[PDB]
């Protein structure tokens, strides 16, 4: 985007990542790197050590911190003091974090300059309108009886892998695919993501996925008519531009993280067909009732409610029974899944050898 939007010559541009570490040989240029590549001090490659020496020796003029909400971390704040620069700009859609270090930003980088409303832009057509919904999936008795006895660590997987969520997801997938919507399914839990992907025959992406494979997944999900839904994870939570993405679903969430809630919602706010008359994007949040998942769900939406977005509770999805096949529809399969999920937890002597 930097090159596309401005007239920056390619020769004056340098990318500092793990793959290529070359820097522009021109007198003045831009260095685009990451916090991992700027805050590390113990281990550095030879080329990366030369790059770090270059950065320290030269007196920079401007620093641009994308997603600055991470600068007040234990050591990421050290880069502000070590790196030399006459001007610091931070860019972030949320200026809040769980700990009290958010206030440290005042003496770390300075005060906040400007903020923009969400509903104002939505009604002015600058951004899309979303019909945020919260689905209440009742846990079945077979799994709930184990929920009561199981400890805190196991009930997390237990109430995330309930069959009702699978069945609702299948019905919604079929309905929205008939409606021709591009669907993203987020899931922090890698095991749950893999189970859903293998059950539904759809791809999954998480930390182990390589860059080439994930790019292929994205390209095909974008331009291939056959594919309309994908199962992303925490990797694609923020700082990714998906003009085609329109529908967002959450089956597994990273606890009460309010910032991640908004960052995940941000993926579908730039839908390509976000200006056609009568369009309304969809954001589903599946939660099990009578569980601490409701506690965390109500705790992770207090920022969206403050902005102005309102979640609609969906007790039932009409026409769910008419779908031909539903995952985990039989009590026999329910029992088998119950047991499975519970069981989840001298050069001449060289020839000798």
């Amino acid at each position: 985007q930097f090159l596309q939007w401005c007239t920056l010559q390619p020769e004056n541009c340098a990318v500092f990542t793990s793959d290529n570490k070359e820097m522009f040989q021109t007198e003045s240029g831009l260095v685009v790197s990451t916090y991992s590549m700027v805050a590390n001090t113990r281990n550095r490659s030879h080329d990366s050590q030369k790059v770090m020496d270059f950065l320290t020796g030269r007196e920079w003029g401007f620093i641009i911190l994308d997603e600055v909400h991470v600068v007040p971390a234990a050591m990421f704040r050290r880069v502000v003091s070590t790196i030399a620069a006459h001007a610091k700009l931070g860019l972030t859609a949320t200026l809040v974090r769980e700990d009290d270090k958010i206030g440290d930003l005042n003496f770390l980088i300075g005060p906040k300059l400007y903020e923009a409303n969400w509903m104002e832009l939505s009604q002015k057509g600058h951004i899309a309108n979303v019909q945020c919904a919260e689905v209440w999936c009742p846990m079945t008795a077979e799994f709930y009886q184990e929920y009561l006895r199981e400890t805190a660590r196991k009930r997390m997987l237990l109430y995330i892998m309930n069959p009702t969520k699978f069945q609702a997801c299948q019905f919604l997938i079929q309905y929205h695919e008939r409606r021709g919507d591009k669907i993203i399914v987020f899931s922090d839990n890698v095991y749950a993501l893999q189970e859903y992907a293998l059950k539904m025959g759809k791809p999954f992406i998480y930390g182990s996925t390589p860059q080439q494979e994930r790019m292929n997944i994205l390209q095909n999900f974008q331009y291939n008519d056959q594919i309309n839904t994908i199962f992303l994870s925490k990797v694609g939570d923020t700082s990714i531009d998906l003009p085609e993405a329109t529908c967002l679903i959450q089956i597994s969430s990273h606890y009460g993280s309010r910032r991640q809630e908004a960052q995940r919602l941000g993926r579908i706010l730039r839908a390509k067909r976000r200006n056609d008359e009568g369009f309304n994007a969809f954001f589903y949040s599946l939660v099990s009732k009578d569980t601490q998942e409701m506690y965390y769900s109500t705790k992770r939406q207090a920022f969206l409610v403050d902005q102005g977005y309102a979640f609609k509770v969906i007790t039932h999805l009409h026409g769910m029974e008419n779908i031909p096949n539903l995952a985990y529809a039989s009590p026999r399969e329910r029992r088998e899944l119950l047991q499975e999920v519970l069981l989840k937890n001298h050069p001449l002597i060289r020839k000798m050898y």
Binding site: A197, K202, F204, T209, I217, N220, Q226
Partner: protein, 39 residues
Amino acid sequence: PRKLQDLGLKPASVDPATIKRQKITNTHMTGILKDYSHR
């Protein structure tokens, strides 16, 4: 051609010496994804 040019006559040829000669993570989707590498 060089002699023809030296004598002031346009040569309709050139010296041939000047002719420059000139761990995939998910696999249940294998065989499904077309390579939309460019747009």
